[PDB]
Amino acid sequence: DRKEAVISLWPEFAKAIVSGKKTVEFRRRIPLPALSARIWIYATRPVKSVIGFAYLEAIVQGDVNTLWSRYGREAFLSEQQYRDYFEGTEKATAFLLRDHQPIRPINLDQLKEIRANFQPPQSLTWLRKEETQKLVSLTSQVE
């Protein structure tokens, strides 16, 4: 079961996902969540918090050039940032996201209380079902 995952992004991109501006997330060799998985968004420093989530509506696997042409507009990052991220490979994975949901940020200390040695994932981290319950139990509307 892979219905609940956390990924890290720099705060401008994280905020773009939870606001619905960024509906495509590009990745390089990442484990695949089950369809309609909830993808939690950890925004990196200085935010250092889970700031919301979105749902995985589709997974695309393709070449880097064509994926930029087809989905780059929904991905928010610049073409240079994209090509830098994919330097040295011609393969690319695109997560297509829907139903973005901002929340009051959940800080790194709370995440550590949930999982004692939580670290911002470099690719993705699965949530255990109890972890998912504790996290959901912390969720609130943005202030």
Residue numbers in the entry: 6 to 148
Task: Please give sentences taken from the publication describing this entry.
In the ethanologenic bacterium Zymomonas mobilis ZM4, the gene ZMO0922 encodes a 148 amino acid polypeptide, which has been annotated as a putative ASCH domain-containing protein (ZmASCH) that belongs to family 23. In vitro assays showed that ZmASCH bound nucleic acids and possessed cleavage activity specifically towards single-stranded RNAs. The weak nuclease activity of ZmASCH depended on magnesium ions and the protein appeared to prefer the consecutive pyrimidine-adenine dinucleotides for its cleavage activity.
This β-barrel is flanked by two pairs of antiparallel α-helices (α2/α3 and α4/α5) as well as the single helix α1. As the ssRNA-cleavage activity of ZmASCH was dependent on magnesium ions, but inhibited by other transition metal ions, such as zinc or cobalt, co-crystallization of the wild-type protein with either ZnCl2 or CoCl2 was attempted. However, we could not locate any bound transition metal ions in either crystal form, suggesting that high affinity binding of the metal ion to the protein molecule is probably accomplished in the presence of a nucleic acid.
